[PDB]
Design a protein around this ligand. Structure first.
Ligand SMILES: *[C@@H]1O[C@H](CO)[C@@H](O[C@@H]2O[C@H](CO)[C@@H](O)[C@H](O)[C@H]2NC(C)=O)[C@H](O)[C@H]1NC(C)=O
Lengths: 121, 49, 107
């Protein structure tokens, strides 16, 4: 009954830009701090970004700190990832995650997205 | 309400009331430089016969 | 940055056998570590939260233990739907870091 449908994947020239969107509908949203997680094809899961319940504090991974920005729109219940200056090491499957934290976000349920294939060629 | 919070009142009479400041932040963040002249060859020290 | 390592990164065991998977950190994470399972082609399903608290909707074959720097994921029996990749996660210092992931296979 939870729905995290994501969009914005496609062929991107190196050094381009994207807006990955995650439409969330089901749980209450905006009471949970939500995450962007990515998985390289054939590799393990990495971590991209985290945003709090009010859009106040945003935290990024130590490799992409500055090329990505994470935002949320609580009126339409969406997550956004602005990706600028993409290299070829960012072709991946991006999931829109709500991790069963319990230290920072304080969530209790694990709701994952579906994942968009962002191919940077 | 912005104006109310500014005049510290609940009644705002008629007129232009300056409240806040609108600065537009930036987006990207480039870092340009020159190409690359000499390259001090490790080609000769790591790869001698 | 809190580096994690997982062992063994390749594993093949038959039905009814037991599987131990050690997650080792580079710093001290007290009991804040999540164990995920990802079957190939789908989003990862969580199995164990805060290194010992098994969830609801998961069978009682899996168990988690350990604390401090060393943690342990234990599968008491391999059913055919246990064939997946298992991941760690820490929670104390942002950024959260996943593990590299171990692959379970059949003989
Ligand atoms: C180290 O030296 C060898 C030999 O000089 C280099 O091998 C040459 O590589 C180029 C391009 O890779 C080829 O066109 C040549 O035919 C190779 N020569 C031989 C004799 O094999 C090697 O590339 C050098 N290492 C580096 C990093 O430049």
């Amino acid at each position: 009954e939870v729905q995290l449908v994501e969009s914005g994947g496609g062929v991107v020239q190196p050094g381009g830009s994207l807006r990955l969107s995650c439409a969330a509908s089901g749980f209450t949203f905006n009471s949970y701090g939500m995450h962007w997680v990515r998985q390289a094809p054939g590799k393990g899961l990495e971590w991209v970004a985290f945003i709090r319940y009010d859009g106040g504090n945003k935290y990024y991974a130590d490799s992409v700190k500055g090329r990505f920005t994470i935002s949320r729109d609580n009126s339409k219940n969406t997550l956004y990832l602005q990706m600028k200056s993409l290299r070829a090491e960012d072709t991946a499957v991006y999931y829109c995650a709500n991790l069963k934290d319990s230290r920072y976000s304080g969530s209790y349920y694990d709701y994952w997205g579906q994942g968009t294939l962002v191919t940077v060629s | 309400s912005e104006t109310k919070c500014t005049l510290k009142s609940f009644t705002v009479e008629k007129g232009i009331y300056q409240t806040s400041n609108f600065r537009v932040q930036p987006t990207e963040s480039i870092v340009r430089f020159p190409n690359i002249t000499n390259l001090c060859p490790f080609d000769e020290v790591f790869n001698a016969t | 940055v809190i580096w994690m390592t997982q062992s063994p990164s390749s594993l093949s065991a038959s039905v009814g056998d037991r599987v131990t998977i050690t997650c080792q950190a580079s710093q001290d994470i007290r009991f804040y570590l999540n164990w995920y399972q990802q079957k190939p082609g789908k989003a990862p399903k969580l199995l164990i939260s805060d290194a010992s608290n098994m969830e609801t909707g998961v069978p009682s074959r899996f168990s988690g233990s350990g604390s401090g720097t060393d943690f342990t994921f234990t599968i008491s029996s391999l059913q055919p739907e246990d064939i997946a990749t298992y991941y760690c996660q820490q929670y104390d210092n942002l950024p959260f870091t996943f593990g590299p992931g171990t692959k379970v296979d059949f003989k």
